[PDB]
Amino acid sequence: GSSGSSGQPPQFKLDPRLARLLGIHTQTRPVIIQALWQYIKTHKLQDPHEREFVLCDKYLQQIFESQRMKFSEIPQRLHALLMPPEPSGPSSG
Length: 93
What we know:
The chain is about 30% helix and about 15% strand. The protein is built from four helices and five strands; from the N terminus they run βαβαβαβαβ. The strands form two sheets. A three-stranded antiparallel sheet has the order 2-1-5. A two-stranded antiparallel ribbon has the order 3-4. The termini are far apart. This is SWI/SNF-related matrix-associated actin-dependent regulator of chromatin subfamily D member 1.
């Protein structure tokens, strides 16, 4: 755990499949994580088997690709969906 300190906030680029899913072009971690949580809550993606797991919906199943995962594994898969909203070099790939 480590939050910014004087300067632009920690914003992460949302995947092309998520950026739309939630509609969050680019936000922070504590801003996205929520927008997501609000999804499993609203979409009641809560695993019917466990209370700590969450069954990714058709969409999520296409983003996370995890039929069933732990709520604590949500932030572990976000890192993937979360990308650096910054360049690096010309010619991608």
